[PDB]
Design a protein around this ligand. Structure first.
Ligand SMILES: CSC[C@H]1O[C@@H](n2cnc3c(N)ncnc32)[C@H](O)[C@@H]1O
Ligand SMILES: CSC[C@H]1O[C@@H](n2cnc3c(N)ncnc32)[C@H](O)[C@@H]1O
Ligand SMILES: [K+]
Ligand SMILES: [K+]
Ligand SMILES: [Mg+2]
Ligand SMILES: [Mg+2]
Ligand SMILES: [Mg+2]
Ligand SMILES: [Mg+2]
Ligand code: NA
Ligand code: NA
Ligand code: NA
Ligand code: NA
Ligand code: NA
Ligand code: NA
Ligand code: NA
Ligand code: NA
Lengths: 380, 380
């Protein structure tokens, strides 16, 4: 009756995550000056290079060199010995205005509440009662392992650490009337970029004792747990030098770690009219409201849109058998309690606020009591 | 007892798909000369620009200018009036060798069958008996609508069409003991780039009569079906000029349209040692083998890897209640019939063959009897 499930996470210096953070730093910089900025900022990173490409129409005056370099500094890439340096890297900008054909079809001359979706697409939200924050344990643990690495790097206790890391956690679960119950951790992987001087045994010992044991409750770890710590054997070259990064290439890390579902759309670098982000945040909010409201133990919500059309084209609720109410009844409750037009979501979730860089590492969900993490009290 | 489900697809000239196709054209060009090429080629597209960034170690001599421009020509961007021209665009190359630290940990001095996974990660395969090709009807129809647009563009019957398109299909389904049964098409969206001269009513009439009715069986369409055809009202600016493209930003279009699950890893631009692609293809092969073998009607397969380790860390089977056998029994059948090491998958699925550009539009699954689409006869 048990099964395995695996999720991964990556650190702040993973090259794809660097791009997500830079894209959201650019978004935040625009929103600080122009709350109605239209932003679709993609970032690419390779050895010595950050390239910004995409479309921004905004009244803000943004110094892209400063914004990009400050984001890279925060991540920790500050010296050529680490493979990347905010002070001396190339920052290239290929940003144009938003297409006028898009603007006229989406938002020009429209009442804000009745703004059209900025694109077509589908989005999902998910929630599970297996943790208090209503997220899968596999990804929660994977994120926390990367956060612990960054903490021990920044506090100097493991000074050989560099910012690029990846983690992966496999949990054995049992099923319980459609809900899932974590039993034990089956396998953990950690790979992290390191300096030239530290040896492999020192790193493997530290990763077990100072990282894993600091993060994962002992009750989940036993004599059979498998550890793959620095499994490649050597990871000195890292960051964009080791692997090109792009915005929107960590969409499963950003969401539910393989649980639930995903509609395909990236979050970072996008203002609220891009429903890939706003409607996925709203769908999370719905899912978490249903679980915290006691209606379900686990739930998946789908929504979809057409460019230029305000109301969603479809809404669907899947409760895995974890409610006494039918999925049709839950759908009716959702329709009575939520208005999923983007021009209403923006108000409910405060999506003109420049908090997006905070979302761009360690997952967008299950953390920090963002508005989409505060359950709505449901009337039914 | 019914529910809605929505999936989308995009055309060959959608800027993200342009990038996937170019990345796979580069991969194929290397494999034609060096079957053991190590390729991790990302492409970015914006107005007037294709940038290649990533890591390739290969004995091939590849003319990137020619390979990129020939791919763009095939897609149909051949004139400045269309917003992009293979003859005159900028092609920039930022390609380096594969990191030596990766190479030593993955494949150097290893027997091919015992090559390590080229990265950690998780991957899923899915199959559903709702269509003969074992794919969800929503995405099959969405892909076919884009293919029809390209056909009518290329044969000159709708000469106002340009290559950038998106489609979205919402189907009403019923549930049947864990399997799903399509009932009707609830909503269709089509947006496609067009010339300056054609008017909106002409386009909407053609999209209904010459595209939708040519693709979607009439039995699924009724008086209540909702059509959003050119919903933005104007789409003259398109391709990379309208929206930046990047490789690996259509991973749900490339797979199951929101059904099943996704592990997050992109396919295009990657050789077989990158398990994001090879293990997802193998997982599809497993799933389709279970459904075509009569063991399940619908199934989701998860696998995961650690960099440098050959055997998967975890394998999981979820049959939605559509088998008389338990998921544990199915897992045992899978373990007895499949060897999911990358250095074995490469042999079973012929993954050194330069056929990858053919996979990079209209989905990687459900088409053309690729090796992962030919079911394995199972012994149990
Ligand atoms: C294998 S390339 C994909 C990711 O794996 C990590 N990586 C890079 N080099 C190594 C290495 N030598 N060993 C382990 N992981 C690595 C980086 O996070 C990179 O973005
Ligand atoms: C809205 S930007 C995302 C995608 O939508 C499409 N698109 C671009 N411009 C328009 C438009 N004016 N109307 C409808 N869809 C568009 C392109 O396929 C683009 O890559
Ligand atoms: K990459
Ligand atoms: K884009
Ligand atoms: Mg990546
Ligand atoms: Mg999208
Ligand atoms: Mg895109
Ligand atoms: Mg990956
Ligand atoms: Na503005
Ligand atoms: Na899942
Ligand atoms: Na989304
Ligand atoms: Na709230
Ligand atoms: Na080679
Ligand atoms: Na799904
Ligand atoms: Na994958
Ligand atoms: Na085969």
């Amino acid at each position: 009756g048990t099964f395995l499930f695996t999720s991964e996470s990556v650190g702040e210096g993973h090259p794809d995550k660097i791009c997500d953070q830079i894209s959201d730093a650019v978004l935040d910089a625009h929103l600080q000056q122009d709350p109605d900025a239209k932003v679709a900022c993609e970032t690419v990173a390779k050895t010595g290079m950050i390239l910004l490409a995409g479309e921004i129409t905004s009244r803000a005056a943004v110094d892209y060199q400063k914004v990009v370099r400050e984001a890279v500094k925060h991540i920790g890439y500050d010296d050529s010995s680490k493979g990347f340096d905010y002070k001396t890297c190339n920052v290239l900008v290929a940003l144009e205005q938003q297409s006028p054909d898009i603007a006229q079809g989406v938002h020009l001359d429209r009442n804000e509440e009745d703004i059209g979706a900025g694109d077509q697409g589908l989005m999902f939200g998910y929630a599970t009662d297996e943790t208090e924050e209503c997220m899968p344990l596999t990804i929660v643990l994977a994120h926390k392992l990367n956060a612990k690495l960054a903490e021990l790097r920044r506090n100097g206790t493991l000074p050989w650490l560099r910012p690029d890391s990846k983690t992966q956690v496999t949990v054995q679960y049992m099923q319980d009337r459609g809900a899932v119950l974590p039993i034990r951790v089956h396998t953990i992987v950690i790979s992290v970029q390191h300096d030239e001087e530290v040896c492999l045994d020192e790193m493997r010992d530290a990763l077990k004792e100072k990282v894993i044991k600091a993060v994962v409750p002992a009750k989940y770890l036993d004599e059979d747990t498998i550890y793959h710590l620095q499994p490649s054997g050597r990871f000195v070259i890292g960051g964009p030098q080791g692997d090109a990064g792009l915005t929107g290439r960590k969409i499963i890390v950003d969401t539910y770690g393989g649980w639930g579902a995903h509609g395909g759309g990236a979050f970072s670098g996008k203002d609220y009219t891009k429903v890939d982000r706003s409607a996925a945040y709203a769908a999370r909010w719905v899912a978490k409201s249903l679980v915290k409201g006691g209606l379900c133990r686990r739930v998946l919500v789908q929504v979809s849109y057409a460019i230029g059309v305000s109301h969603p084209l479809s809404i669907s609720i899947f409760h895995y058998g974890t409610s006494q109410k039918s999925e049709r009844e839950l759908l009716e409750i959702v329709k009575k309690n939520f208005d999923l037009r983007p021009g209403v979501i923006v108000r409910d979730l405060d999506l003109k606020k420049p908090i997006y860089q905070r979302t761009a590492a360690y997952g967008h969900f299950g953390r920090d009591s963002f508005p989409w993490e505060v359950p709505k009290k449901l009337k039914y």
